[PDB]
Amino acid sequence: GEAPNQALLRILKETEFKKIKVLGSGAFGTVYKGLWIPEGEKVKIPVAIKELREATSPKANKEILDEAYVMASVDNPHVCRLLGICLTSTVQLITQLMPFGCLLDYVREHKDNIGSQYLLNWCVQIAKGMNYLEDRRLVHRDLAARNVLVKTPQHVKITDFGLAKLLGAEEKEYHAEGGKVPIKWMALESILHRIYTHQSDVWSYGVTVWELMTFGSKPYDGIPASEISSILEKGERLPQPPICTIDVYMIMVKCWMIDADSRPKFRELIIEFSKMARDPQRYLVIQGDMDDVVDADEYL
Ligand SMILES: CN[C@@H]1C[C@H]2O[C@@](C)([C@@H]1OC)n1c3ccccc3c3c4c(c5c6c(n2c5c31)CCCC6)C(=O)N=C4
C-alpha cells in the first residue's frame, strides 16, 4: 500500500499470435486456444486469448482492464500468468494455456482416478497461491474450484481476477458496493456487511476444499441463496465429505468460523495440508488409491 507497483504491462501485436480452436464462449466474449509467437524469438507459447465480447460497452473494457491490471501485478507459480493485452477494437487478454481446463470440471470428469495425493497437493498449491496473494495484499473475493485451472494434473494455478481488490494504504477490509457475488462461497461477514478480508478468502478456501473432497458437489445443493445467511447463523455448515478423515474435515470447519480471526492463515493451511500430503492415505480414505514450443512458465 506504499510500495510502487512496477509490474510491466505488455502490449501485443495481433499478428504475434494465431488462434487455433475456440475453447469456451458466451457471457463475456470468446476464449480461443492459440499460440503466441513473439518477434523473431523462435518460441511459440500456448496461450488462451479472451476477447471483449464484440459490442464494446465502456463498462466491459474497464473490467478486463482491471483484471489485466491485477493479473500483471502477480508473479507466482500458483497464480495464473498474464502474458499481455492486445489493443484491438475488441481488447484481448492473453494468458497461459491451462490445457486440462478448470479443476471443478476435472474432479467431476475424473472421480475414479483422483488419489488422496492429488487432492492434498492441490490443497497445498491453492493455499500457496493465496498466501502469495495475501503477501501482495490482495483479496481475491472469488475463490472456488471453478476458478482454479489445471496446467497439469500435478500443477494447479488460481485464476479469475474479476473481483480481486487490492487493499489501498493499510486497509484491513474491503467495503464493496452492490452487485452479484457467488453467495455459497462467502464468509458470513461478507453476506451481512459486504466486508472482504484475506480471512473471508480463507472461508472460500474451506468451501473450495470441500468442493474438491466431494469430487465436485455443489455446496448447499438444495438450499437457494436467499436462505444461506440464516442457515449459517444457525451455526450450520457443510457435511463431512465421505473420503474425509476428521483431521481434514476439522480444517474445513475452522475456515468456517464466524470469528474471522479464529479461522486459519493460508500460511498455516500450507503447513497443515503439506504435513498430511506426506502420508495421504492416513487422511483421505479413497477406495482404490510442434518443435519450438515453450510453456509460458519458461518464458521470462
Ligand atoms: C465452462 N467451461 C469452459 C471450458 C473453457 O472455456 C471456458 C469458457 C469455460 O471455463 C470458464 N474458459 C474460460 C472462460 C473465462 C476465462 C477464461 C477461460 C478459459 C481458459 C482456459 C480454458 C480451457 C477450456 N476452457 C477454458 C476457459 C477448455 C479446455 C482447455 C482449456 C485456459 O486454458 N485458460 C483460460
d(CA 202, CA 188): 12
- What are the pocket residues of ligand 1 if the criterion is a CB atom closer than 6 Å to any ligand atom? 23-24, 28, 31, 48, 50, 95, 97-99, 101-102, 149
Q: Which three cell numbers stand for residue 255?
A: 475456515
Q: CB of 30 within 8 A of CB of 22?
A: yes
Segment 161-165 long-range contacts (CB within 8 Å, at least 24 positions apart): 161/66, 161/67, 161/70, 161/71, 162/63, 162/66, 162/67, 164/67, 164/70, 164/133, 164/138, 164/139, 164/140, 165/138, 165/139, 165/141, 165/196
Binding site membership: which residues? 23-31, 50, 95-96, 160
Method: X-ray
Which residue, among 61, 130, 176, 159, has the nearest Cα to 273 in the 3D structure?
130
Q: CB of 33 within 8 A of CB of 101?
A: no
Binding site membership for ATP: which residues? 23-31, 50, 95-96, 160
Domain coordinates in residue numbering, the chain: 1-97, 98-289
Q: Which three cell numbers stand for residue 87?
A: 489493443
Contacts of 206 by beta carbon, 8 Å cutoff, 6+ apart = 251, 252, 253, 254, 255, 256, 263
Instruction: Report the atom number in ligand 1 closest to the C-alpha of 48.
Output: 34
Q: Which of 70, 102, 297 to mutate to test the pocket of ligand 1 (most atoms within 8 A of CB)?
A: 102
- Helix or strand holding residue 95 (H, E): strand 91-96
d(CA 222, CA 228): 11
Specify the resolution in Å: 2.9
Q: Is 142 helix (H, G, I), strand (E, B) or coil?
A: coil
Pairing of the two strands 82-87 and 25-26:
unpaired
165 has which bridge partners? 139
Give the number of C-alpha atoms closer than 13 A to the C-alpha of residue 151, restricted to the C-beta side.
20
Q: How far is the CA of 249 from the centre of ligand 1 (A)?
A: 30
d(CA 98, CA 198): 26
DSSP state of 81: P
Buried b (16+ CB within 10 A) or exposed e, 14-32: eebbeeeeebeeeeebbbb
Give the number of C-alpha atoms closer than 13 A to the C-alpha of residue 243, restricted to the C-beta side.
24
d(CA 252, CA 264): 10
Which residue, among 196, 161, 200, 154, has the nearest Cα to 176 in the 3D structure?
196
Residue with the smallest CA separation from ligand 1 atom 10 is 24
Q: CB of 243 within 8 A of CB of 276?
A: no
d(CA 264, CA 254): 7
Q: What CATH number does the domain located at 1-97 have? A: 3.30.200.20
142 as an active site residue: the answer is yes
Residue 144 phi/psi, 5° resolution? -170, 160
Q: What CATH class is the domain 98-289?
A: mainly alpha
